[PDB]
Every structure is written in structure tokens, then in C-alpha cells.
Write a protein that binds this ligand. Structure first.
Ligand SMILES: Cc1cc2c(cc1C)[n+](C(=O)C(C)C)c1c(=O)[nH]c(=O)nc-1n2C[C@H](O)[C@H](O)[C@H](O)COP(=O)([O-])OP(=O)(O)OC[C@H]1O[C@@H](n2cnc3c(N)ncnc32)[C@H](O)[C@@H]1O
Ligand SMILES: Cc1cc2c(cc1C)[n+](C(=O)C(C)C)c1c(=O)[nH]c(=O)nc-1n2C[C@H](O)[C@H](O)[C@H](O)COP(=O)([O-])OP(=O)(O)OC[C@H]1O[C@@H](n2cnc3c(N)ncnc32)[C@H](O)[C@@H]1O
Ligand SMILES: CC1=C(CCOP(=O)(O)OP(=O)(O)O)S/C(=C(\C)O)N1Cc1cnc(C)nc1N
Ligand SMILES: CC1=C(CCOP(=O)(O)OP(=O)(O)O)S/C(=C(\C)O)N1Cc1cnc(C)nc1N
Ligand SMILES: Cc1ccnc(NC(=O)NS(=O)(=O)c2ccccc2[N+](=O)[O-])n1
Ligand SMILES: Cc1ccnc(NC(=O)NS(=O)(=O)c2ccccc2[N+](=O)[O-])n1
Ligand SMILES: [Mg+2]
Ligand SMILES: [Mg+2]
Lengths: 582, 582
């Protein structure tokens, strides 16, 4: 590593922190400047390897860092000033923690001598973010910067990945010092309980259970994002069907005959059927979240549960397993793969009768949508995008109906193609997320499947897309409503509208606001499409036009995401029919 | 009070909470719906007295409630869903606490049985907001709703006003119960240390000090917002000049001969002079914040300090006073006014020599600006707005250069005409704040003096302005930069630009983005003005056109806010000359 400073020569704390980032392999930050972080931004300009993407609001900054992180496997880095800068990161951090996204957040702070005095732009950010980050730090000495950054990146990326925040007082940024880069990390506790490689004692007991079962199911989630090859090989050696959580899409290719697609509340009927009637549940890298389980005692009630997780706090949290393995699923699969490879003819595994039993359910209840006259079905739009991009686009989304359809109707080949807020479910995620994805993946098609409710929340980032000259494609499914809330309104509150309409009550038939004009304000080419016939061409034009593009897709507002298990329900409660129409 | 329910008849917790609001005199909420707050929104629709203004992002919601609160003296109410809804309020709460703004925030939460399980859209909001609210609550029983709401509004509005958050679990919203409205508030500690009326022992000692002083100064702040009459009478009985904090503008009319205008870092030279050389400092409703004091030992170092504050934790926090009074400044002035009225001829007060000494400073160093050819001076634009509105507009602002000029160059007659984020200094405040102001004041001219950096952050609220048909006027001082950061960049970092340019580096002379097109997207009439000559007419057109209006005012980017005391400095360090030019 080549420094920009002599080994014996003092420099500012701000300059130490930036070098600390360079030494971690950081190439991009998302930083919005302010009083308490100016020094860091000054140090940033004199770096040649780190580029800064300036957002227009710091919530854009964080979600952009998440996009960056989710679409690459690298940690996302964002920087903010004290006070209002810092607090605007809060939703992103909470989002990153719940979805296990590696993130390092750096915030400026008032000078140390003023911490606690309610100074200009002061917020006890360490206090505020304690329950919503993996860990955080207040830097109280310039001597500590090398050690804290190293710890921050280590903690953020190791074990169960998560957000780490580092608060840096202005006077520390200014203090001249000589950094020492060979300090030991002060993480003795965390480091002592980092999971060991799985030994064969546990792994052969699982292969034993597989060979003894008649109806096995793979329940696969966000823990498997780095184990696509391993899981691939595991399936071809067992022939066990694969259900997936929303966070796990793409781990196993959605367009394969062994794929049961997504399970859960808006999961496919056949996936939930498989899990309902399975005798062996192989839960790899999941957290038995309420959205997939529903009522707990009814979830895989006839199943022998095997649960592999890198977090011990997750094992036996919601459903208590029969067999458990604590550690990396990649290694567990690698180990299980060898056992299955060696004893292949010794086992002669055949799950034909079970796989077939599922194949009839896949036909009796496949994913379906209605086409009404010339109106665009949102589902069909996503199918056309899938066909035209050849299933190879990076997709980010907002939250709601459109998010579920983007999950249901696009066929993700690899993981890290699907970027979405699952745990927290934060609106205004898709657009800034797309920015991060595109900066991390300069040669890939990046499409933000967004809703008009979500899109508008962080519309200011269209300024960012244009200025940063990024080829973000926006497929806006415009249905004039907060659809997800409207669906629940329709089915539980006698269709009584409670502030879910997003258009203008005066001109109730006019599309409002005009999303094309937002795009024009930022010099981004845009088109609107209303007839289904024009769709195939409109989307093709979006893809072909160089640089950013917005396509406003008008959809009938009364479509419903199906299937649906009402919250806290069972597989028997599954709703497969109906909409907000007549 | 007429209820919508029989006294003996059960109803939902959601319906109890809404009635609790009606019983408090609530007429407006700012609420964005979601999964965990649907029930509240359903209960809201069946209320006939409370209207809901739906924002497009919940940070808009909070700042709108702040606008409402700041421009009326009533508490502002906002409602949000769990998780991402709740976290998006965070900047508003922190803002409201630092500026002492009465606010009640209600958030939905996951059902009680799931608190702590990282459920769908769960955030420990009570944990997160503890250090940034006056108080908060987790409701654990439907029986507690009447008592908690009453406590919430009491705490939010009594003593030193502030934000209070009430977290309400979904199952509590659904539970049927019969509310009891006569419960005693469980605030024995808070209620026992609520300040008593000031007795004459203290007040005559102050009048004694006034008559003994030769160079007295009134240092007046946000504590005086409800004491404009009392302070008015106090001045006409003493003839003591009035300096003001940013939060206190309008308490004493800026356009009066006894007014020293604003003091502090961007305060007038004569105001800071007065305070520097005063022998008696009358600090009424201020908090000796670093922005006005600078280096503490040098601030009024020759002055006898009298400090009246409703918060005992503020008295002797930063500067230790000689004499102090703990309580309401309105009552203290009322008491002091009688003493001064009775002993008028007995004292024969005359501060001519001191007032005159200040009058020469007011001439030697008045507020000034340069006009460059045909380009618009931002200062002059605000002067024209002042003249044309007759000084009677409600003004909200973003944060930065434009905020200081809106403070310096508009002459506020009454308090609660000036709405601005002072303590936290949050960008994207001016626009949603204006919405709250206009909903609270349907017949007043409401103008948001905003900057292009700040404006874009919450540009989505233009959808809100239009749909809610509110006559918000937006005077956008567009200088293509984060000006305040740029000014500091110019004077401390050799003009080295560190991510402060907001336009497009490709088309560097084109105004970017096009703010008129944002306004058009939301069907809001808009015009751009570049030549100074067209300004008088452009602004007049903004005022005359019914409904919302945006005026894009182009300004040379290298203007500097003056005067300026570099942070942590003295009156001797005052900078009165220069800009970002040649
Ligand atoms: C916003 C929204 C979200 C919805 C939704 C509707 C909306 C409107 N409905 C559904 C739905 O119908 N179906 C659905 O599935 N989701 C749904 N969700 C999202 C859901 O709340 C939640 O995000 C996911 O179900 C959780 O994904 P996961 O179970 O993969 O855990 P995830 O959050 O991905 O966490 C991964 C787990 O794997 C562990 N882990 C991480 N790395 C490793 C490793 N290397 N080795 C072994 N363990 C590891 C980690 O400790 C954690 O326990
Ligand atoms: C964003 C920004 C802000 C700037 C700024 C530049 C920027 C870019 N520069 C300046 C500047 O140059 N000059 C300046 O003045 N501000 C400036 N500020 C804002 C500054 O940080 C701060 O907001 C104010 O100085 C504080 O206003 P205050 O001292 O009136 O206290 P404030 O925050 O209004 O608090 C009022 C005080 O009065 C007390 N109080 C409330 N009600 C009563 C009552 N009824 N009776 C007696 N006590 C009561 C309350 O406890 C509190 O201690
Ligand atoms: C408004 C809303 C939703 C509607 C989103 O509106 P959209 O128009 O963006 O998406 P669509 O459903 O119509 O396709 S879904 C939802 C959930 C699942 O909690 N919420 C509540 C919600 C409210 N606020 C934020 C920041 N995030 C949220 N998820
Ligand atoms: C960007 C910025 C400022 C520039 C604001 O840009 P504007 O264009 O809106 O205003 P102007 O100065 O050019 O007239 S001032 C400032 C301070 C005083 O901390 N910050 C840092 C800042 C950054 N982010 C938020 C939410 N609030 C802030 N105050
Ligand atoms: C652009 C700009 C505007 C206003 N202030 C500043 N910077 C500072 O004030 N720096 S500072 O002196 O260290 C400071 C003193 C008290 C509170 C906060 C800060 N601060 O956040 O930098 N920078
Ligand atoms: C619009 C919409 C979408 C999804 N969910 C919901 N509501 C619920 O799920 N209600 S719920 O069952 O009480 C619930 C269970 C677990 C976590 C969170 C909630 N919740 O926030 O309402 N509402
Ligand atoms: Mg929608
Ligand atoms: Mg500007």
C-alpha cells in the first residue's frame, strides 16, 4: 500500500480516516457535506482512489450505500455531518440491521469539549443508533482512528453482516498525528465466539436425515447469498425442491424445474404446500420471520427441522429445531456435498413421488394474473422486462404491491440481482438503491421497479442519477395509490379509503403528479405507457436509450397481490381469488 | 364535549385515541398510513372535526407539524406507522426538542406479543427517540390511552415546550374498551417542580439594577414568543435597546428605533457591540447558545447578567448569571412592568447617552450588500418581498446563507411570523414547515424563503401543497451551491470545493435542476427571474396569483453572509468585508 504521507510525518485526523478507508479497499463513498464533516470532505478530495457520489438527501446516501453493498457483497460506506445529517441516516441503518447488510456509517460530531451541551447541530447519535446498529463508536482520540475503522469494517462484514456507525468529533478531525497501522483489534469477546468450521459429526447426521425422509424441502434465505454454487451442487446431488424467502431470491435459479419459488404470506401456493406437508425442513440461512411462518405451531408441523445459521441468537428463537448447525452455510454445504458425493450409490436418493406431488400443485395453483381490455397488468410488465433483459438485470424496488410482483414475476438467475427492503420494508428505497447498484456494477442493466408512492419519497435523487451520469432505468408502476395499504383496506375495512389515494381529488382522472416532468426537471428522458400493446416497445426503448430513463407505467389501481395468507394465519387461510373490483 | 359513542358502549383503542385528540382541541393531524397504524387512520376518517393532511414523506409530516406549532402556539400533531414510518420522524423530533417546539408524535407499533422479536417493520422507537424527545411512552394497555394522551399534550405544552412520542401497538388499537376520561395524570415529580409565579423580592432587585446601570441591553430569545405585548410595554418604560437571537425574531418589532436587530455569529455589528460593552445584560428567554456567545469568557465580560428562564437546567449552564429568575418571562415582565409604572417619576430613567452611542455604531456598521450589474442580490429580493407583503408574511426557511438573509433583511412585526430550524439546523424544513403554517393560518401570506439545496430535499411535498390546495408561496434563492458550506470553504480551506456544487458539471452554466419543472409536475404555477429589473414584478405576480406559486430567483453563487464571527471567537474577530469573488 502506497501512502500520500511520509511514515514520520504528522497529518490531520480527517486524513488518517480517509487513508484508513483506502487501506480497507474502499473505492466509493456516499457523502453529503456539512459543518461537522467538512474536514473529512476536504481530505476526500485529496484522495485519488475513493470517489464520492453526492446524494441530494442523506437518506438517499444510506440507501445508495445499501444498494452498493447488496449488489456486490462489499460493504457500503456513507458519510454525514452532525445533527440533521446524522439523524437522516437512521432509516438506512435500521434497514441494514434487519436485512443483515454490511454498512459503515461515518458521522461528524461537535468538538468533544461540547458533547452534551446541546451545541449547534448536536445530536447524541451514538445514543440514538445503539439499538439499530450492529455496533457503534464515539472516537475520543485521533490515536484511535486506525483501530476503530479496522474494527468497524471487520464487525460490519464478519459473522452476520450489519451496520456500524463511527462518530467523529470535529477537533479530532483537525488534530495532527502520526497513525499506527499495526494495532491489535480490541474485540476479544466477539472474536472468541466466531463460529468454527462445521465438523462431520453434525453434517453426516443431516445427510442421514435426508436419506430417511420422503418429503424434504429446502427453506432458503438471505444467508445463502454467497453460496449459490454450493447450493446448486447440493440440489443436483439430492433433488430436493427449493422454496425461498424474499431476501433469498436468486440463491437457487427461479427458472429451474426444482424451484418452488417464494414461500410466505405472498408466496406461491405450491411452495407453502411443500413446507406444510414436508417431513424434513432444511432451513438454510433463514430467520423464521412471521411473514413466511404465519401462525407458528402450524408452520411445518409434521417436519423434522434442520437449521443452519451463522447467528446462534437465531437458532431456536421462533421455531425450535430438531437438528441445528451454528456457522457458515457455505462451509456446511461444502461439507455435506462431499458426503453426498462419496456415498452417492450407497444412498441412491430418489424423491420422485414427492417432487411429482408438488408438480400437480404447481399446475393446480400457478401464479396468475388478469388482463382487462387494453389496460396494462403490472405483472405482465415485469414479465416483459424479464424477457427483454434476459433475466440478467439488477432489480431494486420500493415497498408494497409492486415489490411483491417484482419478486413473483422476474426470474433471478444469480443472487445480488434482487435488491429490496425486506425486514424494515422502507419506502423510497428502490431509487437510491439503484444508484448504489449501478456505481458498483457499471456494466450491468440496473432497473428500479418502483411504485408512485415510494418513488416520490426520494425523487430528489434523480438529480444524482443525471449528474453522476448513471444508466439507471426506472420502471414506475403507477397506480395512483398506496396499493399495499389499499389491498388490506379492501379485504378488512370494507374498502373504506383512509388516506391511500395519491392523486388529486379535484382532477380525479388525471395522472398526478406528472412523473415525466420530475424526470425532465433533471434532464432524464422519459415516456408514459397506458395501452398494453405499446408496452413491449416502450420497455425496449427504455433499455436501448443510453443513460438514465424513466418509464411511467399506468396500471388499474384495484389489482391485488395474490396469493395471500392473512397475518398470523395458516396454509388453510390462503386467499387465492379476488381483487378490488366489482 | 359531544362524543360519537354511548358512555356505556365499548369501542376500538384506535377510536379512543382519536377522541382523546378531539378532547384536546386537535383540529389537524399530519399522518401517513401504514400496516401498524391503519386502525388509527380508519378511526380518523370517522372523525368530523380533525382533518388529516397527508404528506408524501413522513419527514414532511413532522416538519409540517412543526410549522403548524411554530406559527400558532398550538401543539403540532403527526402520526406514522411502525418501523420505517417511525424512523422517518426522527429529524423532526430532534429539531422540535432543540428549538423547544410543542409536538405530539403518535406511532403505530407491532402487536405487544411481538415486541423484541425483530418482527415485520419493527423498530424499538421508544429506545431510539429517548434522548431526542422531552418524554415518550409505550402504551401497554388500552385502559391507559386517555391518561397517556392527556399527559403527552400536557408535557408537550407546559414548562419548556417539546416533542412527546406515543407508541401504540396494533393489538391495543383493536382491543374494545370503555374509556374513562377523569383519570389523574401520573406526573407527580414534573408537576411539583413546575415554576411558581415570580415574587416581587426578585423583581424589584432587577428594577434596582436597571436604575443603577448606564449601559443596559435586552438579550431576547425564543422564550419570549408569547410575551410580545409585555416586552413592548417593558421597553417603553425603560428605553433599553433590544438584541435578539435567531429564534426570538419578532418578539420586539425589527423595524423600531430601539431595535438592535439580531446578535450572534451572523448578527449585526451594533448588536454585538452593545452586548460587548454593556454593564447590564437582561437575558430573557435565551439559552446562551454558542452561535451568539462565541468564546464564553469574552461574552458580556463587563456585564451584570440577569437571566430569566422557565428551565432551571438552563440557568448557569453556559454563563453563570449574577441574578436569576426561574419561571415564565411573561409573568416576570408583567410584574416588572407594574414596579416601573408605579415608581416612574421616582426613577426618571434616561439611557440617551448609551442609546446614542449605539446609534453611531448602527451608522458606522449597518447591514449592507453589493449589487453586481444586472444580477439579483439575494438580500435585495428579501427586501422587496418585505416591502410588498408589508412585513406581514409568515416566513419559513431552509438552512444556510439564504436563512441568514431572510433573518437579516425581513422585518418581523409579531413573533410566530419567523419559522426556522435554529438548534438542529435541518435542511428541507422550509417547505413542509410552510404547509403547516398555511393550514394553521388559512388567511395569511405564507412564503418559504428556500435554498436550492434545501428545497430539493423535501420537494415531494409540492404534491401535498397542490392536492391540499394551499396558497404556499416559494421564493427560491437559487445559487447552484450549498452556500453556507461554500462560504466556510472560501475562508478556511483556500476555496477548495469539496462537494458543494449542486448543478451539472457537464452543462456547468445551465441552471440545474429545473425547479420550474418540479412545480409543473405538481401543477403549481412557476416563473424564473434573473435580471434585477424583473424582480419587483416577478414577486408581485407570485403574491397576486391565487394558490401556490414558485419563483426561481437566480443569484450569483459567491455572495457571503456578513458580518461573521469565526466559530469560538470574540467581537474583535468580527469579519465585515469580503466575498467569494476575485
Ligand atoms: C416489505 C415486505 C416484506 C415481505 C413481505 C411483504 C412486504 C410488503 N412478504 C414476504 C413474503 O411473503 N415472503 C417472504 O419470504 N418475505 C416477505 N417479506 C420480507 C420479510 O419480512 C423478511 O424480510 C424475510 O422473510 C426474511 O428473510 P430471511 O428469512 O432470509 O432472513 P434474512 O433477513 O435474510 O436473514 C438471514 C438469516 O441468515 C443468517 N445468515 C447470514 N449469513 C449466513 C451465513 N453465511 N451462513 C448461515 N447463516 C447466515 C442470519 O443470521 C439471519 O438469521
Ligand atoms: C442553522 C443556523 C442557526 C443559527 C445560525 C446559523 C445557522 C446556519 N447563527 C445564529 C446567529 O448568528 N445568531 C443567533 O441568534 N442564532 C443563530 N443560529 C441558531 C442558534 O444555533 C440557536 O438556534 C439560537 O441561538 C437559540 O435561540 P435562543 O437562545 O432564543 O434559545 P431557544 O432555543 O429559543 O430556547 C429558548 C430558551 O427560553 C426558555 N423559555 C422558553 N419559554 C420560556 C418562558 N415562557 N419564560 C422564560 N423562559 C422560557 C427555554 O427553556 C430555553 O432555554
Ligand atoms: C405506505 C405503505 C405502502 C404503499 C406503497 O405505495 P406504492 O405506490 O409505492 O407501492 P404499491 O403498493 O402501490 O405498489 S406498503 C406499506 C407497508 C407494507 O408497511 N406502507 C407503509 C409505509 C409507510 N412509510 C414508509 C416509509 N414505509 C412503509 N412501508
Ligand atoms: C448542506 C448544508 C448547508 C447548505 C444549504 O444549501 P442551500 O442551497 O439550501 O442554502 P444556501 O446556503 O446555498 O443559501 S448549510 C449547513 C449547515 C449550516 O450545517 N449544511 C449541512 C447540512 C447537511 N444536511 C442537513 C440535513 N442539514 C444541514 N444543515
Ligand atoms: C459551514 C459551517 C457553518 C457553521 N459552523 C461551521 N462549523 C463550526 O461551527 N465548527 S465548530 O466550531 O467546530 C462547532 C462549534 C459548536 C457546535 C458545532 C460545531 N460544528 O458542528 O463544527 N461550519
Ligand atoms: C398493509 C399491510 C401489509 C402487511 N401487513 C399488515 N398488517 C399486519 O401484518 N398486521 S399485524 O398482523 O398486526 C403485524 C404482525 C407482525 C408484525 C407487524 C404487524 N403489523 O405492523 O401490523 N398491513
Ligand atoms: Mg402505487
Ligand atoms: Mg443554494
Amino acid at each position: 500500500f502506497i501512502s500520500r504521507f511520509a511514515p514520520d510525518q504528522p497529518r490531520k485526523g480527517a486524513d488518517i480516516l480517509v487513508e484508513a478507508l483506502e487501506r480497507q479497499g474502499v473505492e466509493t463513498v456516499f457523502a453529503y457535506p456539512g459543518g461537522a464533516s467538512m474536514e473529512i470532505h476536504q481530505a476526500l478530495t485529496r484522495s485519488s482512489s475513493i470517489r464520492n457520489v453526492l446524494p441530494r438527501h442523506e437518506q438517499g446516501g444510506v440507501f445508495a450505500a445499501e444498494g452498493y453493498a447488496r449488489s456486490s457483497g462489499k460493504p457500503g460506506i456513507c458519510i454525514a455531518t452532525s445533527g440533521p445529517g446524522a439523524t437522516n441516516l437512521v432509516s438506512g441503518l435500521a434497514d441494514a440491521l434487519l436485512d443483515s447488510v454490511p454498512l459503515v456509517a461515518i458521522t461528524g460530531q461537535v468538538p468533544r469539549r461540547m458533547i452534551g451541551t446541546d451545541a449547534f447541530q448536536e445530536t447524541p447519535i451514538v445514543e440514538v443508533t445503539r439499538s439499530i446498529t450492529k455496533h457503534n463508536y464515539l472516537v475520543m482520540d485521533v490515536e484511535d482512528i486506525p483501530r476503530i475503522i479496522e474494527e468497524a469494517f471487520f464487525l460490519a462484514t464478519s459473522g452476520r453482516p450489519g451496520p456500524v456507525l463511527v462518530d467523529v468529533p470535529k477537533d479530532i478531525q483537525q488534530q495532527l498525528a502520526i497513525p499506527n497501522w499495526e494495532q491489535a483489534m480490541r474485540l476479544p469477546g466477539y472474536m472468541s465466539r466466531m463460529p468454527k468450521p462445521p465438523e462431520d459429526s453434525h453434517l453426516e447426521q443431516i445427510v442421514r436425515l435426508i436419506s430417511e425422509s420422503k418429503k424434504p424441502v429446502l427453506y432458503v434465505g438471505g444467508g445463502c447469498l454467497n453460496s449459490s454454487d454450493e447450493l446448486g451442487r447440493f440440489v443436483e446431488l439430492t433433488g430436493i425442491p427449493v422454496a425461498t424467502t424474499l431476501m433469498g431470491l436468486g440463491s437457487y435459479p427461479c427458472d429451474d424445474e426444482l424451484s418452488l419459488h417464494m414461500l410466505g404470506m405472498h408466496g406461491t401456493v405450491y411452495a407453502n404446500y411443500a413446507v406444510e406437508h414436508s417431513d424434513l425442513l432444511l432451513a438454510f440461512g433463514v430467520r423464521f420471520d412471521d411473514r413466511v411462518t404465519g401462525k407458528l405451531e402450524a408452520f411445518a408441523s409434521r417436519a423434522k427441522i434442520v437449521h443452519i445459521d451463522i447467528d446462534s441468537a437465531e437458532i431456536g428463537k421462533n421455531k425450535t429445531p430438531h437438528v441445528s448447525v451454528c456457522g457458515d452455510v457455505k462451509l456446511a454445504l461444502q461439507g455435506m456435498n462431499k458426503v453426498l458425493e462419496n456415498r452417492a450409490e450407497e444412498l441412491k436418493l430418489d424423491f420422485g413421488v414427492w417432487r411429482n406431488e408438488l408438480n400437480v400443485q404447481k399446475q393446480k395453483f400457478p401464479l396468475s394474473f388478469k388482463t382487462f381490455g387494453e389496460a396494462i397488468p403490472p405483472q405482465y410488465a415485469i414479465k416483459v422486462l424479464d424477457e427483454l433483459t434476459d433475466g440478467k438485470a439488477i432489480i431494486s424496488t420500493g415497498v408494497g404491491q409492486h415489490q411483491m410482483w417484482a419478486a413473483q414475476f422476474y426470474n433471478y438467475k444469480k443472487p445480488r440481482q434482487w435488491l429490496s427492503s425486506g425486514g424494515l420494508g422502507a419506502m423510497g428505497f428502490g431509487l437510491p438503491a439503484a444508484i448504489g447498484a449501478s456505481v458498483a456494477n457499471p456494466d450491468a442493466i440496473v432497473v428500479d421497479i418502483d411504485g408512485d408512492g415510494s418513488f416520490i419519497m426520494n425523487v430528489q435523487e434523480l438529480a444524482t442519477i443525471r449528474v453522476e451520469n448513471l444508466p439507471v432505468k426506472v420502471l414506475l408502476l403507477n397506480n395512483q395509490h398506496l396499493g399495499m395499504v389499499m389491498q388490506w383496506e379492501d379485504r378488512f375495512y370494507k374498502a373504506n379509503r383512509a388516506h391511500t389515494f395519491l392523486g388529486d381529488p379535484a382532477q380525479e382522472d388525471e395522472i398526478f403528479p406528472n412523473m415525466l416532468l420530475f424526470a425532465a426537471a433533471c434532464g432524464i428522458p422519459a415516456a408514459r405507457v397506458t395501452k398494453k400493446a405499446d408496452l413491449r416497445e416502450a420497455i425496449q426503448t427504455m433499455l436501448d436509450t443510453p443513460g438514465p430513463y424513466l418509464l411511467d407505467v399506468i396500471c388499474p389501481h384495484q389489482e391485488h397481490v395474490l396469493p395471500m395468507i392473512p397475518s398470523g394465519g395458516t396454509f388453510n387461510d390462503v386467499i387465492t381469488e379476488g381483487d378490488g373490483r366489482i
